[model samples]
Target: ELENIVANTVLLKAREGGGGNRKGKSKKWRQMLQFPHISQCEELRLSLERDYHSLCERQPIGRLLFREFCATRPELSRCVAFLDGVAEYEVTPDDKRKACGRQLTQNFLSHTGPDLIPEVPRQLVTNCTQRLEQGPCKDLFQELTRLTHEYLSVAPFADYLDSIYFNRFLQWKWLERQPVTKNTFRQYRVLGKGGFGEVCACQVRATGKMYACKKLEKKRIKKRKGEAMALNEKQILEKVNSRFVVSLAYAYETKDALCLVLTLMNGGDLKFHIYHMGQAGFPEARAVFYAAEICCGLEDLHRERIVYRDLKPENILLDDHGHIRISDLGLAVHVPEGQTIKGRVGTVGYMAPEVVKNERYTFSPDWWALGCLLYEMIAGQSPFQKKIKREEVERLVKEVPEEYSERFSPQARSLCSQLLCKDPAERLGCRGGSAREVKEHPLFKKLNFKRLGAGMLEPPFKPDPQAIYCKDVLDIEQFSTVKGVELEPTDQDFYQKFATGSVPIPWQNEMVETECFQELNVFGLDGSVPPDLDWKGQPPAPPKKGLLQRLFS
Candidate 1:
C-alpha cells in the first residue's frame, strides 16, 4: 500500500511537467508534500523519500512489492494529484481534455475535496461567521462564504489549480496591496439614480479627469437588507479588468455609504437609445455589431467563472464611441468550479425559463438574455416579452417558443432560436459548451471576434457628445433630496477595511478636455443656469451650432 502511494506521487509529478531533472523539480514536489494538507501523514512521506530518487527518475515506475512497504496515511495531496494526472493523461485532443478535467474536478469535489472547511484557518472562519451576523458586514460575508464554498468545491482539480491557489492568495493580500488615499473630487452634478443610490459626475481635483462615482446609502441598504448584495457587486466589479466590462477605479468609504469610482459612460445605456431616444429598429449589420460586443463582455465574465444573471439593455452602457460595457452586477453570481447556481434573479423579460423555475442552472442563461437583447435591437421588443402581467410574462418565457418575423435575417433567426431553447442542456452555448462556439455562429461570420473583444473594431455608431451638452437627454430632477442626507451611526467603520494604496489614475485630463471641449455645457440645455459661470474657471466660449443647426444653416 505504501509503495503504491509513493509510485503514484512520482507518476503525477512526471505528467505535470516531467520536472525534466531540472535540479528543482523533485525539490518543488517535495515542497508540495510539506504543505499541511499532505504533511500530516508521516509514513507517506517516509515511503516516498525511501525510494524518492529511483521512483522520480525519468522512467516508468516499475511494479514493486506493495506488502514490503507497510503504512497507513491519512493525507493524500500527492496521491490525489497523481490520480488526477493519470485521468488527464488518458484524454486526448482539446475537447476530450476539457471533459476529462471537468469530470475529474467533479469527482474530486465529491471525494477528497481540497476545499475542506477544516483546512481553513479557525480564526478566519470565526471572523467571517461573526461578520455575517452584523448588519454592515453581512453582505460582505455572504459573498465571502459563497466564494469560499466555490473554491472548496473545485479545490481538487488540476485545471482549477491556478485559480484555487493564485486567486485566494491575491484576495488575502488585497488589503495590504491597496490602501486608502486622499480623494479630492469636485462633484459636478447627478448623472442618474437607482435602487441603491445616486451616480454622480465628479472630477478629480488632482488630475482634472472626470469619473462616475456611485454612492450607496447605508440606511437604505440596511432597510432593504441589500448589504451582502451590494458587496457582491463591488467584489465582482473589482476583479474585472476587461475593456468590455466597466472597470472599478476605486472603492472609497464615506460617513454614510460606500463609493465606487467607475469609468464614465457618457453616451448613456443601450435601453435609452433603443426605446427612449426615438430610434427605430437597427439595421442587421448594426445589430450584429452590438451583439458581437456583448459577446465579448459575456465571454470575459464567464472566463472569471462569474455568471451575469442580469443582462439587459438597461445594464449595457454605451461609451462616447458607442462601445458597449456590461455593468450592474447586483444579480451576478460566481459558479463554483464544478457546480451550478440556483436563484430566480433577473428582469422579467430577459430571465430564462430555468431561472423562472428556480432550477439549478449554469452560464447558459446569459446567452438566453443575449438572444432577447439581439431581438430587441432588430425587432424593437423582446421576443417573449409583452406588456402583460407578471404571471403571464413568466408563463410566456417558459412555454412559448421564440418566433421571429421575416424582418429578422436568416442568421439572426438561427442564432436567436438556438439561444432561446428552453432546454439549457441543448442550448447553443451549452452544447459545445463555451463562448467560442457561440462566436463561430453564422451571424458573427463577418466579425473578427478576437479584434472585437480587444476593442479594435470601430463602433458602428459614435454618439455625439455635443447632443448631451446641448440637449435635455438625462431626466434631471429639479430639486435635490439626497444631497444633505447625513451618515448613520452604523456607518462608522464600514469602508475603512477596504482602503487600498493601489488606487488607479484611470482617466486622463486630455480625454476629459477633448470630450467637454472649449465651449462646455456643465449644465444640460434645460437645467438651471449656474449662479456664476466663473466658479471653477474662465467663462465658456459662445455655444457652437449643434448638428441640427449646422444642417439648417
Candidate 2:
C-alpha cells in the first residue's frame, strides 16, 4: 500500500534534461494527495541522485566502487538498480535524519577523486580470501570485512624487489660447481631493469622450461642493504607456507654471488593483463573470483603474521593455470610482537596512510594495499591520479569523498569502501574482524565460496592452458625444495679443473674413482682410468722369449 502509492501517485524525479543552476540537478516529488504513503522528503533523494551523477562519473576517483567491494558473485547492473530503489525509499522514510540515502551520498563525496583506479592484487587477494573461507569464526561478515581492512593497510610496496639480486646471486654460486651441459641450457634475451638489477629470459636443458632469470648487480645492492632483504625473504619463505605464494625453490651461495631460483611465470604481470584487455574491462564474475583468490593469499600471510608491504599487480606473476603467484618478498617484513616499522619504504601510490605517517603499524597494513589494488582493477588507474599535484592527490586519498554515481557492482564498492576506509578501526581488519562484515553484505549473497575454494570456477579470462603451462621448460615439481635433490658433480677442492679436452691421465696412487653421469656431455661414463704408464720408471726390458729363444739376449 505504501510503496505502490508512492510510486504511482508521486511525480518522482526521473532522469531529466537541462535547467538553470539545476542544469544537471533534479528533484524527487511524491503525490500531495497521499501523505501516509509519501516520503517526507522524496525531493531530496532526487536532488542527491542528480548531483551524484552530474558531479561524478560512474567510476569516481578512477576506481569503480563495486569492482573493489564484491566478495563473491557480483552483478553490476542489478546492484545499481537496487541502490536506486534503496535511495528512493530512504529519502522519504519516516526518520529523515537517520536516512541511509544521505550517508551514501556523503560517502560518495568523501571518496571522490581522479586517481582512485586499481589493479588486481593477485597473491594478497587469493590468500586473504582463502583464509577467510577456512578461518574458524562466528560471524563471517565481520571477519571478511576485518580481513579486507587489514589487507588494505600493509605498507612499504616497492617495484622490482630483491628478486633480481637473489637470482643473480644464485647463478654465480651454482655455475662454479655444476657445469651446464651444452644441450641443457641456453640464454635468451634480457627482460627489464629494476632499482637493484636486470632480468633475462632463459631456456632450460632437460625439461626445457622457459624461465625469466632476474640477475642483480651486487654493487647496487650494497647500497640498498640487500643482505637484510635476502635474509628477510628467505626467512618468510621458509615460515609462512602457502601454495598461492611464490615459493623459493633454491638458494645457492658461492664465493661472491648468491642466487635464488623460483617458479617461472610466463603470462607476465597483472599490469599486462589489464592493459592488454584495454577498455573492454574484465568480467565481474572473473574479477570477483580473482579477488577471492587474492584474498586467500593475503589471509595466509596474515595468519603467520607476515606483512607483505608490496601488494600491487607488478609484483604478482601469472602462473600456468592462469592462477597468480605472489612474487618479490624482499620488501616483506616480519613485524615482531609489539613492534612496527616506520618511515617511507613502499611505492608512492600504494602505501597506506598510516605507513606514510610513520606511526606504529601492524599486520593490518596489507589490508590497505588490498583496497588500493581493488580500486585500480575497476578504474583502470590509481585511486589518486599519478603525475597530478602531489598534495592534491594525497588529500583525495586521506579525506575520502561523499557523493558519486553507481559505477561498480555492489560487492566491489563494498570491498573498496570498507577496505580503503581512512579510519583504521573501520577498515577491513582481517578474516574475523571488519572484513567478515564485508562478506555478509548483500553483494556477496550468491557467491558460493565452496565453489571458489575448490578452484572449480575459472577466472574471468585466461590464456590457453596448454600454452601457458607448456611455455616453461622447468617441471612444476622442481619448485618444492623439500623433495628436490641438490646437484653435485664432484669435490671441487681435490679435483683438478677439466674442460672439454683438458682431462689428465690418472696415476695409480693419485686416481680417485667416481661415477660420471652420461647426461654430462663433458665427462665420460667408463670407470676405467686412462692408465698412467712408464712416466716415473724406465721401460721394462723386452719380455722374455716365448720359451728361452731370446732369454740370453
Which number leads on TM-score? 1
- lDDT by residue for model 2 (420-504), tens: 8776655776435633554454655566644554455566567643332221222112211222233234422211221111011
Please report, as a residue range, the 10-residue window in candidate 2 with the lowest summed lDDT: 502-511
Q: lDDT of each prediction vs. the true structure?
A: 0.61, 0.47
Backbone Cα, N, C clashes tallied per candidate: 7, 114
Candidate 1 global CA lDDT score: 0.61
lDDT of 1 by residue, 235-344 (tens): 78877778888877667766566777787777777777777766667888888898888888898999999999888987888887789899888889899888877898
Q: Candidate 1 at 471: error in angstroms?
A: 9.2
Which is the leading candidate under lDDT? 1
lDDT of 2 at 54: 26
How many steric clashes does model 2 contain? 114
TM-score of each: 0.57, 0.49
